[PDB]
Amino acid sequence: VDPFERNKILGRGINIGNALEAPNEGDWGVVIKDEFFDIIKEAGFSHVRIPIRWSTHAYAFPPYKIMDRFFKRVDEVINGALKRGLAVVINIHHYEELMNDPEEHKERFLALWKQIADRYKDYPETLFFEILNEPHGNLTPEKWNELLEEALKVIRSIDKKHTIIIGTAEWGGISALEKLSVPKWEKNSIVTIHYYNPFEFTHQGAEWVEGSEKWLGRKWGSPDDQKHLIEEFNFIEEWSKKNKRPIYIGEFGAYRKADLESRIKWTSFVVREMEKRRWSWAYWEFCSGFGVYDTLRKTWNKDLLEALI
């Protein structure tokens, strides 16, 4: 299998967030309606990324069994998307104890991946396995290198067909990319990066971010703006060429509080620069605080959808 061809198949996408990665689906404002897949496919997207919180739906002690009821729900989400001809990225996302206590939670994490790989091993090749969303905290770059290799071994003992998606430590951005090590023996993986630069721009006024109001009225689109973003993407590209790993920008987006123009400029510029590099990508996110589709009103944000598609 050619991971670069798989990365093309992945192509352009959107996160369905604040859904299955909450403690329970619906706790953070989104429930994944089957209808979403028609809406997303009709808009021109190639895939969906489904953040999933397995840790709150599995037993705490060995054999760490994932609940039947939750597996059936995930089946339903995956198959709903596949049915529209969309590719699907599933992950483990918000395993909070793992980030803080990797030494204890490694065993449970790997048992989760054994179960997941086993259940979906015969699913279409348009399903992608993303090991872990944004490794951070006590799960350092070195420890992530250790964990991801063990995850690869566990998954590969079960499934050698599906493409695996591997993120970076220190919250999944470009800072820890140079530290990232993918075993040479693994030949069907895509590296994922989450891009929100400039952070002060994209997160201006972000309520969950400390002192973010200091950045309100921040604009983007200037020409140093463009030089810098191009430079940061050149770094990613270079690493990609040197290591021969395809790239997936699994998350990117600018908060609402950002002005709609600069928002448009930033979004359309990021998109065009990613597509120059043949990178797959997923906008964060479908319908929440960074949402481009209002689910109550059933309307797309036309300006932003145009920037994306």
- Region of residue 304 (left: phi > 0; alpha: psi -120 to 50; beta: else): alpha
- Measured from the CB atom, the residue of 37 and 64 that comes closer to Ni ion is 64
Closest CA to 98 of 86, 106, 87, 90: 106
| String marking each residue 132-161 x if it binds Ni ion according to CB under 5 A | ----------x-------------------
Query: Which of 43, 212, 303, 305 is in the footprint of Ni ion by CB under 5 A?
Result: 303
The answer to the question of residue 260 lying near Ni ion (CB under 5 A) is no
Instruction: Identify whether 149 is a catalytic site residue.
Output: no
- Measured from the CB atom, the residue of 118 and 303 that comes closer to Ni ion is 303
CB atoms within 10 A of CB 93: 21
Beta bridge partners of 280: 248
Annotated active-site residue in 25, 130, 251, 285: 251
The full 3-state SS of 113-153, as one line of letters, equals: HHHHHHHHCCCCCCEEEECCCCCCCCCCHHHHHHHHHHHHH
CA distances from 94 to 105, 201, 307 (A): 13, 24, 29
Q: Which stretch binds Ni ion (CB under 5 A): 9-17, 47-55, 66-74, 285-293?
A: 66-74
3-state SS, residue 227: helix
Query: Which of 67, 216, 230, 309 is in the footprint of Ni ion by CB under 5 A?
Result: 67
End-to-end CA distance of the chain: 28
Q: Least distance in Å: CB of 88 to Ni ion?
A: 22
Instruction: Identify whether 231 is a catalytic site residue.
Output: no
- Measured from the CB atom, the residue of 149 and 303 that comes closer to Ni ion is 303
Annotated active-site residue in 134, 170, 273, 285: 134
Q: Which two tokens stand for residue 85?
A: 């001809």
Under rule CB under 5 A, which residues in 265-284 are in contact with Ni ion?
none
How many residues bind Ni ion (CB under 5 A)? The answer is: 3
- Measured from the CB atom, the residue of 121 and 219 that comes closer to Ni ion is 219
Q: Least distance in Å: CB of 304 to Ni ion?
A: 10
The answer to the question of residue 309 lying near Ni ion (CB under 5 A) is no
CB atoms within 10 A of CB 169: 25
- Chain residues binding Ni ion by CB under 5 A are 67, 142, 303
Q: Catalytic site residues? A: 134, 251
